Design an enzyme around this catalytic site. Structure first.
Site, short mmCIF file in Angstrom:
data_model
loop_
_atom_site.label_atom_id
_atom_site.label_comp_id
_atom_site.label_asym_id
_atom_site.label_seq_id
_atom_site.Cartn_x
_atom_site.Cartn_y
_atom_site.Cartn_z
N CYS A 173 0.91 -1.26 -0.05
CA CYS A 173 0.01 -0.25 0.10
C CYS A 173 0.72 1.20 -0.09
O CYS A 173 1.39 1.34 0.82
CB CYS A 173 -0.77 0.09 1.15
SG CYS A 173 -2.00 1.30 1.05
N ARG A 222 -0.14 4.46 2.63
CA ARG A 222 -0.18 4.23 4.21
C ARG A 222 0.18 5.61 5.06
O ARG A 222 0.22 5.32 6.19
CB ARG A 222 0.85 3.28 4.75
CG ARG A 222 0.41 1.95 4.38
CD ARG A 222 1.36 0.82 4.67
NE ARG A 222 2.39 0.73 3.67
CZ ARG A 222 3.49 0.09 3.53
NH1 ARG A 222 3.94 -0.61 4.82
NH2 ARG A 222 4.45 -0.03 2.69
N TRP A 229 -9.58 5.52 -1.06
CA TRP A 229 -9.77 6.60 -2.34
C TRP A 229 -8.69 6.06 -3.39
O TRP A 229 -7.62 5.40 -2.76
CB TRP A 229 -9.82 7.82 -2.34
CG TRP A 229 -8.66 8.48 -1.49
CD1 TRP A 229 -7.20 8.75 -2.21
CD2 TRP A 229 -8.34 8.82 -0.26
NE1 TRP A 229 -6.50 9.47 -1.30
CE2 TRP A 229 -7.06 9.43 -0.14
CE3 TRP A 229 -9.38 8.94 0.83
CZ2 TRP A 229 -6.65 9.99 1.00
CZ3 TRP A 229 -8.80 9.49 2.24
CH2 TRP A 229 -7.46 10.07 2.22
N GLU A 240 -4.46 3.49 -11.08
CA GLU A 240 -4.90 2.30 -10.73
C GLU A 240 -6.20 2.02 -11.90
O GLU A 240 -6.46 1.01 -12.37
CB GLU A 240 -5.94 2.16 -9.48
CG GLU A 240 -5.11 1.86 -8.25
CD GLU A 240 -5.75 2.09 -6.82
OE1 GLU A 240 -5.62 2.95 -6.51
OE2 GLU A 240 -6.17 0.98 -6.56
C1 HEM Z 1 -6.58 6.48 1.58
C2 HEM Z 1 -6.37 6.09 0.33
C3 HEM Z 1 -5.48 4.88 -0.21
C4 HEM Z 1 -4.80 4.98 -1.25
C5 HEM Z 1 -4.48 6.04 -2.37
C6 HEM Z 1 -4.04 3.35 -1.48
C7 HEM Z 1 -3.52 3.32 -2.54
C8 HEM Z 1 -3.36 1.73 -2.71
C9 HEM Z 1 -2.60 1.20 -4.09
C10 HEM Z 1 -2.27 2.21 -5.09
C11 HEM Z 1 -2.56 -0.17 -3.81
C12 HEM Z 1 -2.49 -1.25 -5.18
C13 HEM Z 1 -3.88 -1.65 -5.47
C14 HEM Z 1 -3.33 -2.47 -6.95
O1 HEM Z 1 -2.72 -2.36 -7.44
O2 HEM Z 1 -4.67 -3.10 -7.13
C15 HEM Z 1 -2.77 -0.18 -2.85
C16 HEM Z 1 -2.74 -1.65 -1.97
C17 HEM Z 1 -3.06 -2.17 -0.70
N1 HEM Z 1 -3.83 -1.14 0.13
FE1 HEM Z 1 -3.92 1.05 -0.01
N2 HEM Z 1 -4.48 2.79 -0.41
C18 HEM Z 1 -5.56 3.53 0.35
C19 HEM Z 1 -6.24 3.00 1.27
C20 HEM Z 1 -6.21 1.82 1.83
C21 HEM Z 1 -6.79 1.37 3.03
C22 HEM Z 1 -7.98 2.37 3.95
C23 HEM Z 1 -6.51 0.19 3.66
C24 HEM Z 1 -6.83 -0.62 4.62
C25 HEM Z 1 -7.29 -0.39 5.81
C26 HEM Z 1 -5.59 -0.11 2.50
C27 HEM Z 1 -5.05 -1.72 2.35
C28 HEM Z 1 -4.22 -2.01 1.17
C29 HEM Z 1 -3.74 -3.21 1.10
C30 HEM Z 1 -3.97 -4.50 2.04
C31 HEM Z 1 -3.27 -3.30 -0.18
C32 HEM Z 1 -2.52 -4.67 -1.08
C33 HEM Z 1 -3.68 -5.63 -1.33
C34 HEM Z 1 -3.09 -6.56 -2.37
O3 HEM Z 1 -2.07 -7.36 -2.14
O4 HEM Z 1 -3.85 -7.06 -3.34
N3 HEM Z 1 -5.33 0.79 1.39
N4 HEM Z 1 -3.23 0.79 -1.99
C1 LIG Z 2 -8.66 -0.20 -0.06
C2 LIG Z 2 -8.73 0.62 -1.12
S1 LIG Z 2 -7.52 1.57 -1.48
C3 LIG Z 2 -7.04 1.68 -3.35
N1 LIG Z 2 -6.83 2.95 -4.02
N2 LIG Z 2 -6.96 0.46 -3.92
C4 LIG Z 2 -6.87 -0.69 -3.70
C5 LIG Z 2 -7.52 -1.75 -4.74
C6 LIG Z 2 -7.38 -2.99 -4.94
C7 LIG Z 2 -6.67 -3.61 -3.52
C8 LIG Z 2 -6.01 -2.84 -2.56
C9 LIG Z 2 -6.13 -1.49 -2.68
#
Ligand code: HEM
Ligand SMILES: CCS/C(N)=N\c1ccccc1
Ligand code: HEM
Ligand SMILES: C[C@H](O)[C@H](O)[C@H]1CNc2nc(N)[nH]c(=O)c2N1
Ligand SMILES: C[C@H](O)[C@H](O)[C@H]1CNc2nc(N)[nH]c(=O)c2N1
Ligand SMILES: CCS/C(N)=N\c1ccccc1
Ligand SMILES: [Zn+2]
Lengths: 414, 416
Positions: free
Chosen positions: B120, B123, B292, B297
């Site tokens: 992520c 974070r 968001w 993405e």
């Molecule tokens: C606040 C805005 C946030 C942004 C912009 C963000 C952005 C991202 C992005 C760009 C990815 C990759 C997604 C993909 O390639 O499919 C990601 C992965 C991830 N995010 Fe964040 N995130 C945010 C919020 C969150 C929240 C609220 C959580 C959990 C409480 C979270 C948990 C995760 C996890 C676990 C992954 C990896 C999932 C996997 O392995 O497929 N994210 N995030």
């Molecule tokens: C938690 C929505 S935060 C986000 N921008 N995208 C995700 C899409 C797929 C998996 C994890 C994150």
């Protein structure tokens, strides 16, 4: 176990069995992955004042000799048996041994073939090998290097080549090429920390000056070579301008681009890496091929710690640099990469764009899967610095490990 | 020097050492022999269904570790309350085989899980997460109510707010609570007679599962799918999300007037619903979380991946580029305009979104914060660096150490 390797674009799966032949450890462990680190903590290649453990060396030598005869379909032959005996005999009495030219040629090609960070390996079998092992002075090194350059450049029709200087010997200093590449633009530090030229070459630029070089004051001054014979101070040699082919950069439609005075050399020749073959180490073995456009257009010209021309091109393009969301950086970068491709094609100098290059690597992966049951590859280095997911390699899982023969990093001689 | 991984930023030339990795209690897929860091699903974390109750000895250890993390976080380590909480957990597991988390512990664990997520890039926001406690939910219908409320709160008419809804944990030999869909909002993928796909190819299987369970399919390119919610030991029930609750954004381009004519669009809320939330050995098989979007993405992966909507050629043709040769960089030009369109459209509709430059810059700040706060930050380089303009962002030049910390969000097998 053998890793399952999947390509998420096509859904195809393969199993890498080649990794089982690795005998050298990488930086990762089950507790943490360090695959994104650029250099080793110590995997490098420590000093050579003493003879390498006879047992170890012999084990590596035998393995290589086995690899060699297997390549010529003469395994178990009389020649194979006698060659192995020859190596054993030499090691037991001298603590080292020597390669025959044919073995050296095979070894060099394998080292390239095994380099996990090289995306152009589909060309691995086509490499001109220059045996420079009968070299005894810096002056002779310079003569060999000039011949390598003339041949490799070939008036714009680049040909891959490597020149191999004397192997390292116990208790004796190494033959070394101080410059990281045979062609490097000077980086001059002045006034308030800024740098005129290439910031990556500040240290080497200073070393040359310290050793008698009369510095220039341009952004693209081709540096002289610091060549070092065993246990001797390095010597300075100026490359004949007519040997260093360069390409002035211009844009296919943006008339003002050429006015930026940007340019880049045609020949990418690595000169600071070590070539290891059957336990023997070649501290000076410059190798070259041709550029992939992103190396110049994206990394060399756009990296913030390099020429960092992104904002200049953006302003010239009248883009909105007020905010990140306008994607001015992305737009500028694409045009810069376009100008590089256009210019090299105009100058009739070999170059390959990142799409074509990655497409060929995918074929290489398939060729190697059938040939050796796998292919070591470093995802972070294989995927281009721009348009990553727009290329096939982004969607391809990879396995990274160390095979020998190999090109390895080594300590700076100073 | 220090007996820990030396991490370098090649842009700034700065160095740090990761001591946090020393805290990892779970092994990843790499070994000294070979690096498997580029594999999407290496079979480690993979929370495969482990029916029969877990080893009390195993759970206890994980439980104590989490309680310690909790008390450490509120600065009361070694206190009476700490020792008493430890005793209670051991007693509860001793008599029931499992245990339950206090409200404040669940909130802490959920945030830590996000904080610990190596993939992520967003974070820096980890501290601001609305945690909806739904551990009282007892039916598929009630899961739907909870989910609708989550969507309404998280969407907040465009001014998105990060949130997570936690349903009951897995129990001894009992059925799991599960959301079959990978995301709360997904566009149908219809297999065509000629073998092609209309809609999103990524959702072919789930789309068919919905049909198999009574859903009347449409024939559009952006048909929002219904949800297949599953309560313990029950077949999944189908639920249609009220259109008014699913905010979508029609895509248009700032200067290319014809882009809007393409009829492209994307939903505002990214909500992951098929991952498992693990806290102190407890497993929450149904705990959807949302934040968001980062523009790449949608603009790069979802719209341009060869196996997704694959619109690169269409857009390039519209821009009148030379798609017959790689060296024209037509793919690169189109992808840039498509990404700009996503940012422009979301900004116009006043829906939260962050471009890849701003997002990565904020992640660098996060790394600095975590270096001081915990001595490091686990990060998956391959997932952190954006799919386009990689080296134009700061993360590309930053070395990273990847490792597994708990609490954590883990992949789990599909319930079907
Ligand atoms: C606040 C805005 C946030 C942004 C912009 C963000 C952005 C991202 C992005 C760009 C990815 C990759 C997604 C993909 O390639 O499919 C990601 C992965 C991830 N995010 Fe964040 N995130 C945010 C919020 C969150 C929240 C609220 C959580 C959990 C409480 C979270 C948990 C995760 C996890 C676990 C992954 C990896 C999932 C996997 O392995 O497929 N994210 N995030
Ligand atoms: C938690 C929505 S935060 C986000 N921008 N995208 C995700 C899409 C797929 C998996 C994890 C994150
Ligand atoms: C024929 C054209 C070739 C192309 C297009 C090509 C392209 C590349 C690229 C893009 C990189 C990364 C460069 C960087 O980011 O700095 C790379 C790395 C590498 N290539 Fe190739 N290559 C070619 C020929 C060669 C040859 C002839 C050899 C050796 C015989 C070779 C050995 C390597 C090695 C060892 C690396 C990794 C260097 C490092 O770790 O820094 N390549 N190549
Ligand atoms: C920190 C990170 O490993 C580093 O920036 C790497 C990433 N990928 C790369 N890929 C290539 N081809 N060349 C490089 O120099 C790098 N640098
Ligand atoms: C094979 C490779 O691991 C795969 O394509 C990865 C690369 N990086 C990624 N990065 C992000 N953010 N999301 C992804 O889905 C992927 N896919
Ligand atoms: C061997 C030149 S082949 C090439 N395109 N580039 C490189 C530049 C620096 C290091 C390694 C490869
Ligand atoms: Zn690794």
């Amino acid at each position: 176990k053998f890793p399952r390797v999947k390509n998420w674009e096509l859904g195809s799966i393969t199993y890498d069995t080649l990794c089982a032949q690795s005998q050298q450890d990488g930086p990762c462990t089950p507790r943490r992955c360090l695959g994104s680190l650029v250099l080793p903590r110590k995997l490098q290649t420590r000093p050579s004042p003493g003879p390498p453990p006879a047992e170890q060396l012999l084990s590596q030598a035998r393995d290589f000799i086995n690899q060699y005869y297997s390549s010529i379909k003469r395994s178990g032959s009389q020649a194979h048996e006698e060659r192995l005996q020859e190596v054993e005999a030499e090691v037991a009495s001298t603590g080292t041994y020597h390669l025959r030219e044919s073995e050296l040629v095979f070894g060099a090609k394998q080292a390239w073939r095994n380099a996990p960070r090289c995306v152009g390996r589909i060309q691995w079998g086509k490499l001109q090998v220059f045996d420079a092992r009968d070299c005894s002075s810096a002056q002779e090194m310079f003569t060999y290097i000039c011949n390598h350059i003339k041949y490799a450049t070939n008036r714009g029709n680049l040909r891959s080549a490597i020149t191999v200087f004397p192997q390292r010997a116990p208790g004796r200093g190494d033959f070394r090429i101080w410059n990281s590449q045979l062609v490097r633009y000077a980086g001059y530090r002045q006034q308030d920390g800024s740098v005129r030229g290439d910031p990556a070459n500040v240290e080497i630029t200073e070393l040359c000056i310290q050793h008698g070089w009369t510095p220039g004051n341009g952004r693209f001054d081709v540096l002289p070579l610091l060549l070092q014979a065993p246990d001797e101070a390095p010597e300075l040699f100026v490359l004949p301008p007519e040997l260093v082919l360069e390409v002035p950069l211009e844009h296919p439609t943006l008339e003002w681009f050429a006015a930026l005075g940007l340019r880049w050399y045609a020949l990418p020749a690595v000169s600071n890496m070590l070539l290891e073959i059957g336990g023997l180490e070649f501290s000076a073995a410059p190798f070259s091929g041709w550029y992939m456009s992103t190396e110049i257009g994206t990394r060399n010209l756009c990296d913030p710690h390099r020429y960092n021309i992104l904002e200049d091109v953006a302003v010239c393009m009248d883009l909105d640099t007020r905010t990140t969301s306008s994607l001015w950086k992305d737009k500028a970068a694409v045009e810069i990469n376009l100008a590089v491709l256009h210019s090299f094609q105009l100058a009739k100098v070999t170059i390959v764009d990142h799409h074509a290059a990655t497409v060929s690597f995918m074929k290489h992966l398939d060729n190697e899967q059938k040939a050796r049951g796998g292919c070591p590859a470093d995802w972070a280095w294989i995927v281009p610095p721009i348009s990553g997911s727009l290329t096939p390699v982004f969607h391809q899982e990879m396995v990274n490990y160390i095979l020998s023969p190999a090109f390895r990093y080594q300590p700076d001689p100073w």
